[PDB]
Design a protein around this ligand. Sequence first.
Ligand SMILES: *Cc1cc2c(cc1C)nc1c(=O)[nH]c(=O)nc-1n2C[C@H](O)[C@H](O)[C@H](O)COP(=O)(O)OP(=O)(O)OC[C@H]1O[C@@H](n2cnc3c(N)ncnc32)[C@H](O)[C@@H]1O
Ligand SMILES: *[C@@H]1O[C@H](CO)[C@@H](O[C@@H]2O[C@H](CO)[C@@H](O[C@@H]3O[C@H](CO)[C@@H](O)[C@H](O)[C@@H]3O)[C@H](O)[C@H]2NC(C)=O)[C@H](O)[C@H]1NC(C)=O
Ligand SMILES: *[C@@H]1O[C@H](CO)[C@@H](O)[C@H](O)[C@H]1NC(C)=O
Ligand SMILES: [Mg+2]
Length: 495
Amino acid sequence: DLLSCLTFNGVRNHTVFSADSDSDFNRFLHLSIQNPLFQNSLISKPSAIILPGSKEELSNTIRCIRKGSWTIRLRSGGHSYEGLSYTSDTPFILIDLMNLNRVSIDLESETAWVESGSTLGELYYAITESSSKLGFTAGWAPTVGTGGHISGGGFGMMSRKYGLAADNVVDAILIDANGAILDRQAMGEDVFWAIRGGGGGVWGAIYAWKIKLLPVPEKVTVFRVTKNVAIDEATSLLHKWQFVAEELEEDFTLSVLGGADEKQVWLTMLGFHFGLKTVAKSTFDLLFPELGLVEEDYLEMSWGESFAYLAGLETVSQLNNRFLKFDERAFKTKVDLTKEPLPSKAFYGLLERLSKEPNGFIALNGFGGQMSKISSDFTPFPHRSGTRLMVEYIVAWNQSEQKKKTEFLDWLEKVYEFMKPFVSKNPRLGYVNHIDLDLGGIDWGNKTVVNNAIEISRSWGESYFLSNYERLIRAKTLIDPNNVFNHPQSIPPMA
Ligand SMILES: *Cc1cc2c(cc1C)nc1c(=O)[nH]c(=O)nc-1n2C[C@H](O)[C@H](O)[C@H](O)COP(=O)(O)OP(=O)(O)OC[C@H]1O[C@@H](n2cnc3c(N)ncnc32)[C@H](O)[C@@H]1O
Ligand SMILES: *[C@@H]1O[C@H](CO)[C@@H](O[C@@H]2O[C@H](CO)[C@@H](O[C@@H]3O[C@H](CO)[C@@H](O)[C@H](O)[C@@H]3O)[C@H](O)[C@H]2NC(C)=O)[C@H](O)[C@H]1NC(C)=O
Ligand SMILES: *[C@@H]1O[C@H](CO)[C@@H](O)[C@H](O)[C@H]1NC(C)=O
Ligand SMILES: [Mg+2]
C-alpha cells in the first residue's frame, strides 16, 4: 500500500526490510549509523527505507506514510547520540535524506541554500571551494548532518565569534505533517524560531536551510598541542584554562580534550585565532604562559584548512566525504553547562576518575564572547549570558571490550554524579543536540503518560530550553497538532 502510494506519486528510491544481512536494505540502514551502540541485531529496524531526491519527493513521502500507520523517522547524518533517527519501539519508516545533499552558494548575497542531508563537512568544503574569505559557524565533526545539527542549535570553534549555526539561519523550507512546502514566510515567525534550535524530529522535515555566510580572514591561526603531565599540573592547567577561555576576546577560542591512565594525564589544547600567528602567540604568551606553547606550535592556514585540521582530518578534501568514519567505537556521552567557576578540586576529582578509566575522556569549551551577546530567547537555545562552560564526559569502547560495557556506563554515571554540586542546578542544564535519555522519555502509546505529557516532558524540556519551553509547545501545537513528528523527548503538542 505504501509502495503503491509512493509509485503513484513518483517516489522510486525505496527498499523494504530484508533479513538478508547483505541486503541493500541493511547496507542503507548501516551507512549512517554513527553509534555502534545501536547497530546490533536486537535493535529495532525500519519496515522500509525511503531516499527522497527532491522537496516534492519528500513531501509525497510524508503524505503517503500518513495514509498508513507508521512512525516517521528522519535521518540526515545519523549522529544522534541515542540513535533516535533510525530506531523506534513502534513500526517505523526511515526517511534517509542522504540524496538531499545539494549546497548552493550565492556569492553575490553571501548566503547558501543547504539541503538538509548535507553534512557539515560537505558544507565547509563547498564554502572553501567558493571563497577564501567566507566561512560558517557549526560543529567540529564533518560527518554530522545539517538536518539534526542545525535543528538543535550547533556549537563549535567559531561560536564565540558568531554564535550557533542556527543563529545564522535566515530562511528554511519545512515540510509539514501534511506535506506542505513552507518557507519562512509561510511557516510564520513562531515556527521559524522553533526550528532554529528546538530539536530535530519534532516540527516536520527540514528540506533545506538558508544560511548567512560569515567573513573569515584568508589566514587564521590554529594549534593542537598535547601536554603529557601529572595530576597536580593538569589540575592547575585546567583550573586556569576556564578563566582564560571564557574571558578571551571573541577572535580567540581555546578548548580542551582530556584523559588519563594512572599517573599519566594528557590534555590536548585546541586553539583558534581569527588572525595571524604573531597576535595569537602574544595573546597566549600573556594570558596562559603555563601552556608552554612555542612558535612552531602555531600554524597559519586557510579557514577551510583550519576546520579540516581541528577535526583531525588529513586534508580539506576529506571534509567532502560523508562516509569517512570519525570513529568505530560504541559510546555514551553526557554534558553539563556551568554558571559558576569550577573549583580546583572538581578538576582534580575528574582527573582522578579519568585516571582509573582510560576509555573515558572529557571535552571542555568556554562560552562568552558572542554567546553572551545573544539573548536567551533569540532562538530556542537558552544558554547565553551567564553560561561559563560546556563540559562533555564520554566513554567509548570497541567490540573486543564489549563485556566491560556495564562497567563503562557505571563509570560515566559516577562521573556525572560527582560533578553534580559544581555545575548548573535547579535545573541541571542540558543541550538538545546532546540528547540524553537518562533524563526520561515519553511513551506516546501510553495514555496516562500522554495526558500528563507537558509536566512529564518539563524534566528534559526545561533542561534543554529553560523558559523557551512554553513558546516551543505553542509552536508545536501550531505546526504539528497531531504529533506526526515524535520521539521519546519531542516537544508535546497541547491536547
Ligand atoms: C556524532 C557526533 C555528533 C556531534 C559531534 C561530533 C560527533 C562525532 N560534535 C558536535 C559539535 O561539535 N557541536 C554540536 O553542537 N554538536 C555536536 N555533535 C552532536 C550533533 O550536533 C547531534 O548529534 C546532531 O543532532 C546530529 O545531527 P545529524 O543530522 O547528524 O543526526 P540524525 O541522527 O540524522 O538526526 C538527529 C535528530 O534530528 C532529526 N532530523 C534529522 N534530519 C532532519 C531534518 N531534515 N528535519 C527535521 N529533523 C531531522 C532526526 O530525526 C533526529 O531526531
Ligand atoms: C537510491 O539512492 C542510492 C544512494 O544514493 C543510490 O545508490 C547510489 O547510486 C549512485 C549512482 O549509481 C552510486 O554512485 C556510483 O558509484 C559507483 C561506484 O560504485 C561509481 O563508479 C559511479 O561513478 C557512481 O557515482 C552510489 O555508489 C550509490 N550509493 C550507494 C550508497 O549505494 C541508488 O542508485 C538509488 N536507487 C534507485 C533505485 O534509484
Ligand atoms: C504507562 O506508563 C506508566 C508510567 O510510566 C506505567 O506505570 C504503566 O505501566 C503504563 N501503562 C500502560 C498501559 O502501558
Ligand atoms: Mg546474503
